[PDB]
């Protein structure tokens, strides 16, 4: 019973970072070697574990978190760190045992003239506890004056839309990041 690592990596459409998917891969043979053969990688990094020695190890839970991030903001997915994405959308823990996989997707994820589907949480009152998620679309409040439903002035819609076009530079090009947290699941 091979693990569904094939399904996680070749999703036709991923989700925005603010609402990131999660898959509890449990009770299957991992076979991590399938990643290199099929998908070329941009930033293949692991913390607390080794790439080659990943197959000959046993874990009870190997999670999988997937989202799409700007190229220059991939580096915010790491232990600690501060930024728009790490602090307010998806915060990794300090003592992190897992692997982070990032590979370019400008060929497919970029749209013809606009990819306003993907959003990130620009405004939040405070940082996120490690491995958390917020999908609230309530209007943010700025200033002691009470905030009504209409955004208008001093109240903002938190989520802000990426702009993806094929002519954009490598910094602003779309990327796909899958984080496999570690915690039966013993590869061959």
């Amino acid at each position, epitope marked *: 019973n091979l693990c569904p690592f094939d399904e996680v990596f070749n999703a036709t459409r991923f989700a925005s970072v603010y609402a990131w998917n999660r898959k509890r891969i449990s009770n299957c043979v991992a076979d991590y070697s399938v990643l290199y053969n099929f998908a070329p990688f941009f930033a293949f990094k692991c913390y607390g574990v080794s790439p080659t020695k990943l197959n000959d190890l046993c874990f009870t839970n190997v999670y999988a978190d997937s989202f799409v991030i700007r190229g220059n903001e991939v580096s915010q997915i790491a232990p600690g760190q501060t930024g728009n994405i790490a602090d307010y959308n998806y915060k990794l823990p300090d003592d992190f045992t897992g692997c982070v996989i990032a590979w370019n997707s400008n060929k497919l994820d970029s749209k013809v003239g606009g990819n306003y589907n993907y959003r990130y949480r620009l405004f939040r009152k405070s*940082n996120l506890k490690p491995f958390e998620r917020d999908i609230s679309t309530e209007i943010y409040q700025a200033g002691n004056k009470p905030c009504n439903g209409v955004a208008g002035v001093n109240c903002y819609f938190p989520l802000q839309s990426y702009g993806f076009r094929p002519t954009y530079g*490598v910094g602003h090009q779309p990327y796909r990041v899958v984080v496999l947290s570690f915690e039966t699941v013993c590869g061959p």
Partner: antibody
């Protein structure tokens, strides 16, 4: 909303100053607030930034000598500097960020010259 | 890293005609760019933000539209009070963040 700024004057090289950003209408502990520098007869430059969370990013030219602070008691923003002859010879501005790129509410500048 | 530069620099424009300003961004750019106006000896105020969004209190006289690397702003009316200076910006990654680039000057 108004952002009146105080502090300034002349400080000798190697001295220290602090500037306070008084804001009446917006919460300093809820908005992206930042410091903008403008030498006389030249373009603008960016100094600091201070997120709603406990985060702060500095420019390369103002790192290690410039410290920013926020006090919700007075609803004001403070910048602490340990001046240098060419690091601080400019008017300083206080601003808020609406859409993650645009600074709208710019306060009146404060002259901070070193001699 | 990207560098923001403006081609016109100094300009001479009369009351009757219009003025067109352009600032370029190296290595491509997103759709987020803001235009500022700074009369001499005054704190600058936001004029146009994002992609030709226009702002409350900014006259419909001003309109700045562009996409990708080539960005520009144009003024349609006769410019009664001759404007002075204008700037671009774009927020960036950790080290640089706000990049304003060289200024622009327009007058009679």
């Amino acid at each position: 909303v108004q952002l009146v700024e105080s502090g300034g004057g002349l400080v000798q090289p190697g001295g220290s100053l602090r500037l306070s950003c008084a804001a009446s209408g917006l919460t300093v502990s809820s908005n992206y607030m930042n410091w903008v520098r403008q030498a006389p007869g030249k373009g603008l430059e960016w100094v600091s930034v201070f997120y709603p969370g406990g985060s702060t990013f500095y420019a390369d030219s103002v790192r290690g000598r410039f410290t920013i602070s926020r006090d919700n008691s007075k609803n004001t923003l403070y910048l602490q500097m340990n001046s240098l002859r060419a690091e601080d010879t400019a008017v300083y501005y206080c601003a808020r960020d609406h859409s993650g790129h645009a600074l709208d509410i710019w306060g009146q500048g404060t002259m901070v010259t070193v001699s | 890293d990207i560098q923001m530069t403006q081609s016109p620099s100094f300009l001479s424009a009369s009351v009757g005609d219009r003025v067109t300003i352009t600032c370029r961004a190296s290595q491509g750019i997103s759709s987020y760019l803001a235009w500022y106006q700074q009369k001499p000896g005054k704190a600058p105020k936001l004029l146009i933000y994002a992609a030709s969004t226009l702002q409350s209190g900014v006259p419909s006289r001003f309109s700045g539209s562009g996409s990708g690397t080539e960005f520009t702003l144009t003024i349609s009316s006769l410019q009664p009070e001759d404007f002075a200076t204008y700037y671009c910006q774009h927020l960036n990654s950790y080290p640089s963040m706000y990049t304003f680039g060289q200024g622009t000057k327009v007058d009679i």
